[PDB]
Amino acid sequence: HRFVQKVEEMVQNHMTYSLQDVGGDANWQLVVEEGEMKVYRREVEENGIVLDPLKATHAVKGVTGHEVCNYFWNVDVRNDWETTIENFHVVETLADNAIIIYQTHKRVSQRDVLYLSVIRKIPALTENDPETWIVCNFSVDHDSAPLNNRCVRAKINVAMICQTLVSISRDNILCKITYVANVNPGGWAPASVLRAVAKREYPKFLKRFTSYVQEKTAGKPILF
């Protein structure tokens, strides 16, 4: 499909930049911690607009990276875990593993987003290394979804990056998660407010989504 080079670059960007340890990085602040989940942000403004990169790490017992990424990507199950969305539809199917989604968000003016969502397995260089599953969601343009007057068009670069540690049952597997979000809404809101909402909604989402994967996979054969 036409976005293959763009997908490869975004995926490559995440594998090279998004997996670096931020725990020791002094430019990032650990803002939320609950259980095995740690949520970090870097306060960034460009031309007076809050762009705060967000990064969360998590460790989820009894699920694989493949499972987590499947549930995060698969639109067929979106409604079962998603809390912030009013409406959404698949604008175009690019490939078995790549789609374009238009969606509107619940009012927190209304935001809409138009993004390519792709799921990929990144091979390990050796059998001594873990394989990586990644879902990359990034804003694209589409002629069938132009800018409208009712919604404000957000621009996103979001990744859910998962590796599985295996030491065979669910007791013996752990999914190490890195979630990154670089989001720009359009126009204006108070910085204080945008930062308070982000601190709330991201950990809430991650906690709920990872619990959902655990619930949905328990007792089932393991999808590696």
Side-chain angles (χ1 to χ4, degrees):
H1 63 84
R2 68 192 183 274
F3 286 106
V4 68
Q5 289 169 18
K6 178 61 166 173
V7 166
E8 199 63 28
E9 151 189 305
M10 299 295 286
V11 168
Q12 197 51 54
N13 182 289
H14 284 299
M15 296 301 294
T16 69
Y17 294 98
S18 304
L19 295 183
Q20 293 176 50
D21 166 275
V22 296
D25 191 322
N27 286 118
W28 291 77
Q29 188 184 19
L30 179 53
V31 293
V32 179
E33 183 175 348
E34 180 175 351
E36 302 72 21
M37 180 184 58
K38 287 177 173 201
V39 186
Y40 304 78
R41 80 169 154 217
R42 192 196 200 290
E43 282 193 355
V44 177
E45 283 182 32
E46 283 166 11
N47 306 315
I49 302 304
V50 173
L51 297 190
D52 297 6
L54 184 139
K55 171 165 166 165
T57 54
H58 204 162
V60 184
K61 292 165 158 54
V63 302
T64 68
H66 194 171
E67 283 170 344
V68 169
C69 284
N70 276 350
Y71 281 100
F72 185 62
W73 182 78
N74 186 17
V75 293
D76 302 333
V77 295
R78 183 63 39 89
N79 306 137
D80 304 326
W81 63 268
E82 175 68 65
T83 208
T84 62
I85 289 170
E86 189 191 61
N87 299 119
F88 87 88
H89 67 93
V90 177
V91 170
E92 183 182 351
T93 303
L94 297 166
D96 285 356
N97 72 331
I99 50 171
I100 296 163
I101 298 171
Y102 175 83
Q103 71 187 36
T104 57
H105 291 276
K106 280 162 167 44
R107 193 151 146 175
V108 180
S109 57
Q110 200 152 328
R111 263 68 193 152
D112 65 1
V113 66
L114 176 68
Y115 63 98
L116 193 160
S117 183
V118 55
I119 182 167
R120 278 212 33 73
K121 185 186 57 54
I122 302 306
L125 290 184
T126 69
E127 296 189 315
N128 311 298
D129 297 314
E131 282 191 324
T132 313
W133 281 87
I134 182 167
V135 179
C136 190
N137 299 334
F138 62 93
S139 291
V140 299
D141 296 330
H142 195 97
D143 285 349
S144 308
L147 305 173
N148 62 59
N149 291 316
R150 57 194 184 276
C151 283
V152 167
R153 184 72 42 96
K155 300 310 190 74
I156 71 162
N157 175 14
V158 162
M160 173 83 71
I161 312 165
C162 309
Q163 297 173 335
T164 308
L165 279 46
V166 188
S167 69
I168 204 78
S169 77
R170 299 248 168 213
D171 254 35
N172 314 304
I173 64 167
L174 181 73
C175 181
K176 295 287 279 161
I177 296 173
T178 292
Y179 173 86
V180 291
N182 284 254
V183 170
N184 141 256
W188 197 93
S192 73
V193 183
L194 287 169
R195 280 161 178 157
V197 179
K199 250 193 207 194
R200 182 181 78 249
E201 289 306 298
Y202 286 93
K204 178 165 187 276
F205 142 65
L206 287 158
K207 193 193 168 292
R208 179 172 164 82
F209 173 73
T210 49
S211 296
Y212 166 80
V213 180
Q214 285 179 305
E215 283 206 310
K216 220 82 185 194
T217 55
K220 286 190 186 190
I222 298 160
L223 184 74
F224 290 101

